[PDB]
Amino acid sequence: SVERVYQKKTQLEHILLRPDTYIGSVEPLTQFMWVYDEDVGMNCREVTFVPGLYKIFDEILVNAADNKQRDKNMTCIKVSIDPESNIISIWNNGKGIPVVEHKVEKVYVPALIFGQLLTSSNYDDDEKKVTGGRNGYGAKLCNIFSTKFTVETACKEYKHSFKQTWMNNMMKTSEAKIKHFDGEDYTCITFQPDLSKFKMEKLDKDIVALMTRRAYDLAGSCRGVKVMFNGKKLPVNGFRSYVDLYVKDKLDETGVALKVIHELANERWDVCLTLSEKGFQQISFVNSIATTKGGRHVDYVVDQVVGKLPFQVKNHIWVFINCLIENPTFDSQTKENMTLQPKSFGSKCQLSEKFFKAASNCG
Amino acid sequence: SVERVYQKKTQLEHILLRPDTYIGSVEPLTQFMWVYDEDVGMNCREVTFVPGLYKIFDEILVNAADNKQRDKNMTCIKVSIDPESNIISIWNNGKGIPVVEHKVEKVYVPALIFGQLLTSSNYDDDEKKVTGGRNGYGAKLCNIFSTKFTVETACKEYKHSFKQTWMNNMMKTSEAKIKHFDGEDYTCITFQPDLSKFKMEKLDKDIVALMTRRAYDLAGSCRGVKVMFNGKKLPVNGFRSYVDLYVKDKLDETGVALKVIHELANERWDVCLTLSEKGFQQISFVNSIATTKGGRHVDYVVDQVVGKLPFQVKNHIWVFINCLIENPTFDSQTKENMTLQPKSFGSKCQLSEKFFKAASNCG
Numbered sequence: 156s157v158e159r160v161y162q163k164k165t166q167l168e169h170i171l172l173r174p175d176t177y178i179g180s181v182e183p184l185t186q187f188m189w190v191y192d193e194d195v196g197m198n199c200r201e202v203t204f205v206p207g208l209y210k211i212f213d214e215i216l217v218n219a220a221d222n223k224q225r226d227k228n229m230t231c232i233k234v235s236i237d238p239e240s241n242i243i244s245i246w247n248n249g250k251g252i253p254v255v256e257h258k259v260e261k262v263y264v265p266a267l268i269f270g271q272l273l274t275s276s277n278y279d280d281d282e283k284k285v286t287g288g289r290n291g292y293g294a295k296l297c298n299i300f301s302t303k304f305t306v307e308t309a310c311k312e313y314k315h316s317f318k319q320t321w322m323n324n325m326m327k328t329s330e331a332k333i334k335h336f337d338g339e340d341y342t343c344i345t346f347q348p349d350l351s352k353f354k355m356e357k358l359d360k361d362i363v364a365l366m367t368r369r370a371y372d373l374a375g376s377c378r379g380v381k382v383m384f385n386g387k388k389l390p391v392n393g394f395r396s397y398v399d400l401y402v403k404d405k406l407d408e409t410g411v412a413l414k415v416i417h418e419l420a421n422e423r424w425d426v427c428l429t430l431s432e433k434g435f436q437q438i439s440f441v442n443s444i445a446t447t448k449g450g451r452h453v454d455y456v457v458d459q460v461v462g463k464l465p466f467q468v469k470n471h472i473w474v475f476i477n478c479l480i481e482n483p484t485f486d487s488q489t490k491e492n493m494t495l496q497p498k499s500f501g502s503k504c505q506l507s508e509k510f511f512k513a514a515s516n517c518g
Numbered sequence: 519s520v521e522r523v524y525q526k527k528t529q530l531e532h533i534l535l536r537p538d539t540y541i542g543s544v545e546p547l548t549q550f551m552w553v554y555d556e557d558v559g560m561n562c563r564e565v566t567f568v569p570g571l572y573k574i575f576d577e578i579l580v581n582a583a584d585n586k587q588r589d590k591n592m593t594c595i596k597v598s599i600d601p602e603s604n605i606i607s608i609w610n611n612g613k614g615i616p617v618v619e620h621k622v623e624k625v626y627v628p629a630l631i632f633g634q635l636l637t638s639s640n641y642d643d644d645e646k647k648v649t650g651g652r653n654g655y656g657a658k659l660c661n662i663f664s665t666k667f668t669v670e671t672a673c674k675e676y677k678h679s680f681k682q683t684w685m686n687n688m689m690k691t692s693e694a695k696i697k698h699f700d701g702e703d704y705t706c707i708t709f710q711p712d713l714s715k716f717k718m719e720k721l722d723k724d725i726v727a728l729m730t731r732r733a734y735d736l737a738g739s740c741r742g743v744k745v746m747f748n749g750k751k752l753p754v755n756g757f758r759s760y761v762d763l764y765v766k767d768k769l770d771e772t773g774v775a776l777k778v779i780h781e782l783a784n785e786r787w788d789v790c791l792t793l794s795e796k797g798f799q800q801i802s803f804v805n806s807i808a809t810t811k812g813g814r815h816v817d818y819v820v821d822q823v824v825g826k827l828p829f830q831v832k833n834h835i836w837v838f839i840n841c842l843i844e845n846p847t848f849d850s851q852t853k854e855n856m857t858l859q860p861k862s863f864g865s866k867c868q869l870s871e872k873f874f875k876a877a878s879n880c881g
């Protein structure tokens with residue numbers, strides 16, 4: 156029959172029917188990842204987790220980091236995970252979201268941007284503010300992949316504060332609680348991922364170790380923000396000290412700790428380099444998004460560095476990149492590989508002569 | 519201002535603003551690909567092309583191949599490319615699309631499924647009919663990335679034929695031309711890709727060589743269908759003869775043509791194997807989609823074959839796979855890597871003892 160065979164779906168129903176095209180695999184994947192385990196901290200090991208779950212988390216986390224670019228007066232992000240209750244909350248300060256009726260869509264601005272698809276402050280490519288956000292899906296994707304999803308924000312400029320809760324995959328919602336407000340701006344997103352959509356029973360060791368690492372990553376990647384994880388400040392300040400998490404207790408060929416060369420080439424390019432004993436490795440960030448497969452920004456810096464010293468060189472390089480790119484593109488929705496051409500990055504990276512010399516004498 | 523900063527987009531406007539998240543990169547990419555060049559045919563070489571363009575083409579092409587699964591009485595697909603006029607047309611026979619009013623959406627069924635987003639015959643996972651189609655975007659994506667887009671179809675069962683033309687990125691359309699019809703069913707999609715969205719001036723040698731290869735690929739992958747390219751039947755029948763396109767004039771270490779082992783393990787798994795002298799290579803298809811990066815179906819067969827003969831073995835294998843999978847998933851929209859777990863493929867592949875023995879004595 157024609158109406159059973161040929162079907163239109165709503166957007167919301169399409170996301171739930173085709174989860175993997177929006178949030179990546181909802182099936183387990185086993186691979187070697189850098190994670191931060193409670194007892195031993197930063198280590199590379201075999202991890203089994205669901206990419207789709209990692210990704211709705213990372214979406215809320217990158218949104219906090221974007222706010223720093225939105226408002227440089229932002230100083231802090233708190234990340235909290237309660238595995239036993241199934242709760243994740245991410246809090247930032249600095250400017251909040253205007254708590255007012257949008258005059259075109261006739262709803263409160265936070266309602267619109269967390270409750271309706273294809274909504275964003277980043278559709279105009281006002282180049283400046285190099286946010287990881289771009290498409291206007293991430294926050295709704297978390298909401299839809301959650302049994303419960305709470306947005307609190309307050310914006311002094313607009314004199315009000317906002318709270319609204321969503322439930323059952325964004326199919327159900329309270330009315331906004333709206334109040335007068337004159338305090339410090341904050342946004343706080345609190346959600347319970349819908350573990351049944353990922354075939355998991357609990358947030359397990361492996362996913363909490365992955366999620367914990369992204370909080371370190373934020374401390375490492377996001378200049379000028381303290382990060383607290385479960386109520387504690389992460390002892391990371393500057394990129395070099397984040398890199399130190401990885402090279403702590405690594406040896407060269409002669410049993411001597413690794414030497415690390417660092418240059419902040421400009422605001423958009425922070426670069427550390429040492430010897431690899433394990434082939435080509437890279438740790439890299441674009442707009443605080445972890446490009447774990449890398450891409451054109453890694454190629455761009457590595458070609459330069461390889462410039463001085465053919466592809467056998469690449470084989471002994473361990474490169475750490477923290478960069479900012481205008482309108483990053485990715486070869487998939489899980490964003491581990493950034494595909495933008497160098498031409499249209501909006502910046503250049505020229506490492507100094509001091510760095511190339513310093514890079515000779517390290518391995 | 520709040521309504522300039524916080525924006526909702528329509529679906530259509532979002533696709534045009536964020537092309538790369540739907541059709542892959544709209545920027546050039548340079549890499550080594552198998553292509554079919556007019557003069558020399560199947561060869562591996564350096565090619566510069568736009569993934570997004572390849573992909574709207576491939577979407578119309580996989581839809582033709584899916585129809586074979588829809589109706590096994592289908593015998594032919596004609597592919598035609600006129601670079602100078604900027605026209606691509608793909609014709610298939612076998613059952614057409616019901617030319618009737620959809621009683622729920624109140625439009626002609628072909629209008630609905632080529633003119634409205636998120637429309638498909640493949641949303642119910644009626645496992646059987648292992649089509650590459652699944653999400654209900656592909657055909658609209660071609661339409662949207664076209665200056666002009668024409669759908670003709672006819673379905674004898676429903677006594678009518680249909681023609682409708684779309685223009686300017688699916689923003690403009692004629693009324694359906696609807697007629698009485700009693701002839702042989704066909705569907706014919708004719709489009710002019712919008713070269714301005716891909717920064718190209720003409721369909722160039724490299725893209726026509728890529729597109730031509732997919733027609734060979736179809737002849738190779740789609741059992742029981744003749745393929746014509748620019749009015750000529752492709753001299754391919756069966757998978758072994760397609761594989762022959764690749765191994766023609768290849769040598770082993772002793773200057774002797776490559777020996778090729780073939781088994782059709784079952785309808786869903788056709789497998790050819792020879793020696794590689796160039797590391798691990800694979801040519802593979804899932805539901806007639808070219809998995810050029812491979813995935814869990816390649817891993818599945820290779821592990822088996824590697825089973826008999828550790829990862830140094832992989833290094834001397836050139837494997838060709840034509841398979842059928844129920845509800846394939848992919849790690850990106852350009853679908854070169856298939857991510858479904860073997861468990862839920864809907865079939866098994868056990869290669870016979872004859873094949874493992876035959877595979878010893880080939881290199």
Ligand SMILES: Nc1ncnc2c1ncn2[C@@H]1O[C@H](COP(=O)(O)OP(=O)(O)O)[C@@H](O)[C@H]1O
Nearest residue numbers: 218222268275276288289290291292293294342
């Ligand atoms: N923590 C936050 N602080 C302030 N604004 C936020 C925060 N999280 C999200 N937003 C706003 O909500 C919008 C919707 O977010 P999202 O769905 O992630 O889309 P985007 O791709 O723009 O990040 C953002 O564009 C931004 O304007």
Ligand SMILES: Nc1ncnc2c1ncn2[C@@H]1O[C@H](COP(=O)(O)OP(=O)(O)O)[C@@H](O)[C@H]1O
Nearest residue numbers: 581585631638639651652653654655656657705
């Ligand atoms: N050549 C064809 N012959 C018959 N039906 C077709 C053809 N091309 C497309 N269709 C129909 O149009 C629908 C829309 O196509 P598409 O956007 O590619 O989505 P899907 O992911 O289902 O392939 C298909 O589901 C199928 O029902």
Ligand SMILES: C[C@H]([C@H](C)[NH+]1CC(=O)NC(=O)C1)[NH+]1CC(=O)NC(=O)C1
Nearest residue numbers: 176177290292488539540653655851
């Ligand atoms: C929009 C989707 C993208 C993958 N589409 C959905 C689909 O099923 N098929 C397609 O080819 C197009 N992307 C993921 C997401 O969550 N947000 C995006 O805008 C991109």
Ligand SMILES: [Mg+2]
Nearest residue numbers: 218288293294
């Ligand atoms: Mg975002």
Ligand SMILES: [Mg+2]
Nearest residue numbers: 581651656657
């Ligand atoms: Mg299709």
